[PDB]
TrEMBL record:
Belongs to the glycosyl hydrolase 10 (cellulase F) family. It comes from Thermotoga maritima (strain ATCC 43589 / DSM 3109 / JCM 10099 / NBRC 100826 / MSB8). One of its GO terms (biological process) is xylan catabolic process. It catalyses: Endohydrolysis of (1->4)-beta-D-xylosidic linkages in xylans. Its EC number is 3.2.1.8. This is Beta-xylanase. The keyword Signal applies.
Length: 324
């Protein structure tokens, strides 16, 4: 009774983010086995990002990404593309020179059309624009925004949809799970985009949280308002970081409670189509390096053994299945 088996019975996808070159890891066999056994949706953690897939202005490298897609297809998993427009991990040919509006727009269009067309029909969901909103509730002053203005967002979606009209295009961001200044800006942004015919098919909530969880009432209401905009909802990069000092047992218990609650709420909203963790084993996680003093934020420990949260999630899924 794996997570993906339960997911399939609830008509949703449960997955993870695949680490760079997972096929050549010292423990590739084990990593791949746990992955194929538990999940039915895969997001390449980095190998579909600009610096890897488009290393030079006129050169593309789809090699690593194709291996992610190949693993997914062979193991009956759908692919979640990530990400077409972001301010980080951009190549030197982009950040190392000055651009004018028209020039950067042509670059953006070429990148998007080339990548989306290359995987047409093979990537079901694309994170078209990632983190375009500041933590102040305004447009993030990225190279894209400063050079082009806010229209780069609308255009990215329009161009992606032209390249693959069947792909579900979403806006992805962090700290917008609850109703707050940031999510309010995102809500109004997407509302206006769809009002003018922009193909924003869904919204992605990264869900990079900690053992303290979230204000669940706010999360519930926020999910409902976005769903009412006619959006499909995706929990995209979930992890629940815990401190690496006090009582691990206590923190893992809280972690399990948080996961169970998040799943409970998500499953209660028909608009949520998938839930993915930003990885699945604490052996391979970005958290320890980004959040000082924290870690052990995933489903399995360093030895691929299920943690309390894994069972808590499975329990919730089983409960929902029986309720309906
Ligand atoms: O180097 C990668 C990191 O950038 C990180 O990936 C980022 C984390 O923040 C999210 O909002 C982004 O969408 C995601 O791409 O973790 C994986 C590292 O390999």
């Amino acid at each position: 009774v794996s997570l993906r088996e339960l997911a399939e019975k609830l008509n949703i996808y449960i997955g993870f983010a695949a680490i760079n070159n997972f096929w050549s890891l010292s423990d590739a066999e084990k990593y791949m086995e746990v992955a194929r056994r538990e999940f039915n949706i895969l997001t390449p953690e980095n190998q579909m990002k600009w610096d890897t897939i488009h290393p030079e202005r006129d050169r593309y490298n789809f090699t690593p990404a194709e291996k992610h897609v190949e693993f997914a297809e062979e193991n009956d998993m759908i692919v979640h593309g990530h990400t077409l427009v972001w301010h980080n991990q951009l190549p030197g040919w982009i950040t190392g020179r000055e651009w004018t509006k028209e020039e950067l727009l042509n670059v953006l269009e070429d990148h998007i059309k080339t990548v989306v067309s290359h995987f047409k029909g093979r990537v079901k969901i694309w994170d078209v624009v990632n983190e375009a909103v500041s933590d102040s509730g305004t447009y993030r002053e990225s190279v894209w925004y400063k050079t082009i203005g806010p229209e780069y967002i609308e255009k990215a979606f329009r161009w992606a949809k032209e390249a693959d009209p069947d792909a579900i295009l979403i806006y992805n961001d962090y700290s917008i799970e609850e109703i707050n200044a940031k999510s309010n800006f995102v809500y109004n942004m997407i509302k206006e985009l769809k009002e003018k015919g922009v193909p924003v098919d869904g919204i992605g909530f990264q869900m990079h949280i900690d053992y303290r969880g979230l204000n669940y009432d706010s999360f519930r209401r926020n999910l409902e308002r976005f769903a009412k905009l006619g959006l499909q909802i995706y929990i995209t990069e979930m992890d629940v970081r815990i401190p690496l000092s006090g009582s691990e047992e206590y923190y893992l218990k809280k972690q399990a409670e948080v996961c169970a609650k998040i799943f409970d709420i998500c499953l209660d909203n028909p608009a949520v189509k998938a839930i993915q963790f930003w990885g699945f084993t604490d052996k391979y996680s970005w958290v320890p390096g980004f959040f000082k003093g924290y870690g052990k934020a995933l489903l399995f420990d360093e030895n691929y053994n299920p943690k309390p949260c894994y069972y808590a999630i499975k329990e919730v899924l089983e409960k929902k299945i029986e309720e309906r």
